[PDB]
């Protein structure tokens, strides 16, 4: 029942701004202490900034100082971290947390995405893998979807709208010439595709897309 | 400033059995009012880090016993005395005790199972992309166990580096495997100048390669 969801990632030039948000529930989110915590490219994590309960009191790690506000709104539960002057240190997964006093960073958001670059938004290519030269050893068949050529992170990807997530790889993007590339499979039992349909759903949050793509197979 | 290192940085360690990881700190993190405030969270992939313990040894809600937390001074350790698959993933500790609150590096626990062969499969550029003038062929070897492993791509029967992007999952908790991908990217021009291309791999479990492989003409 705690919920934390953060927005407003995406990506911002360099020495540019951004506002990111984020909407507590299920607490009484104006008595607690409340933070934002970042992680890394390198997934090392950085204490970032602070806000007493009221609102009154704020600490900042002394890279962000004078650059980030933390703020907060009591009436409608929401935090908010203003970034400015922007760098690329600054490129990081942002998570806001509760912190209870000395007894931690007890519940965290899932986090948004923040890049800072110079290069442009570009929105996924989006491919269907069917499987080639294959149909042996075992009664599954293994599916993808190839998610090529976009800018920033990140994608989501799923299939048929979550319902298939117990045989699904997404792999990481690689990133080759200021784009990314990623593969996401789905294995799943020979007798439901093709007799069945398979989408995968990919969402670009930085571009504003969503793409399905039904997997259909190969032919002459 | 205070530093704090881990280690190991990756901890190898089979189910049911004991793991320990260590936190040291470069000055002593005893605060001024003589608590000590460490903390250990644990990052599970795909996840959001989750508390486990908070002043050395105290238990965050619904964290088993099986968890547990000591130390003084300079010297921390989580222990979890009998390892689960479900445990898999980064544990970083992190001090609030002096300024400023700094986390560890991270230490990765690695679930040390059976080995598990690749499930190899080969997946022609799909005809939709070769207007873009390039073609893309990519590789998946799913679910195995160790991570050593040797891939490489043939067209025309003559080896390919040129091009080829892998990337590879970590650990997943389901079965304890990893997954990887490959994918050898070419103009349409070079991509129709040859007919066969190839994705090979070696592994523990398999010393001789396993071969999959398509003709750019068969559909």
């Known amino acids: 029942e705690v919920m934390l969801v953060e927005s407003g990632g995406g990506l911002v030039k360099p020495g540019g701004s951004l506002k990111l948000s984020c909407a507590a529930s299920?607490?009484?989110?104006?008595?607690?202490?409340m933070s934002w915590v970042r992680q890394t490219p390198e997934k090392r994590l950085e204490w970032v900034a602070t806000?007493?309960?009221?609102?009154?009191?704020?600490y900042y790690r002394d890279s962000v100082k004078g650059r980030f506000t933390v703020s907060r709104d009591n009436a409608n539960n929401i935090l908010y971290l203003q970034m400015s002057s922007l760098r690329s240190e600054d490129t990081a997964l942002y998570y806001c947390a509760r912190r209870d006093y000395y007894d931690g960073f007890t519940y965290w958001g899932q986090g948004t995405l923040v890049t800072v670059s110079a290069a442009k938004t570009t929105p996924p290519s989006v491919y269907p893998l069917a499987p080639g030269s294959a149909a042996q050893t075992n009664s599954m068949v293994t599916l993808g979807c190839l998610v090529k050529g976009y800018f920033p992170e990140p994608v989501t990807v799923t299939w048929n709208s979550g319902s298939l997530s117990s045989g699904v790889h997404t792999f990481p993007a690689v990133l080759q010439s200021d784009l990314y590339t990623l593969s996401s499979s789905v294995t799943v039992p020979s007798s439901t595709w093709p007799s069945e349909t398979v989408t995968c759903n990919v969402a670009h949050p930085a571009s504003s897309t969503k793409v399905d793509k039904k997997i259909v197979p190969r032919d002459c | 400033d205070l530093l704090m290192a881990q280690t190991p940085l990756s901890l190898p360690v089979s189910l049911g059995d004991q793991a320990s990881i260590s936190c040291r700190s470069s000055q002593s993190l005893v605060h001024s009012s003589g608590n000590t405030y460490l903390e250990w969270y644990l990052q599970k992939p795909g996840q959001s880090p989750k508390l486990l313990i908070y002043?050395?040894?105290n238990r965050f809600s619904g964290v088993p016993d099986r968890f547990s937390g000591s130390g003084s001074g300079t010297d921390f350790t989580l222990k979890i005395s009998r390892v689960e698959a479900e445990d898999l993933g980064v544990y970083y500790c992190?001090?609030?005790?002096?300024?400023?609150?700094?986390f560890g590096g991270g230490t990765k626990l690695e679930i040390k199972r059976a080995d598990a062969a690749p499930t190899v499969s080969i997946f022609p550029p799909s005809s939709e992309q070769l207007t873009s003038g390039g073609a893309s062929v990519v590789c998946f070897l799913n679910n195995f166990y160790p991570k050593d492993i040797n891939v490489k791509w043939k067209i025309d029967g003559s080896e390919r580096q040129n091009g080829v992007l892998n990337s590879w999952t970590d650990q997943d908790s389901k079965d304890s495997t990893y997954s990887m991908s490959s994918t050898l990217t070419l103009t349409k021009d070079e991509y129709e100048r040859h007919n066969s291309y190839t994705c090979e791999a070696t592994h523990k479990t398999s010393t001789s390669p396993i071969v999959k492989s398509f003709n750019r003409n068969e559909c």
């Open positions: 992190f001090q609030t005790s002096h300024v400023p609150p700094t």
């Open positions: 299920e607490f009484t989110f104006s008595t607690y202490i």
């Open positions: 806000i007493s309960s009221s609102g009154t009191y704020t």
């Open positions: 002043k050395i040894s």
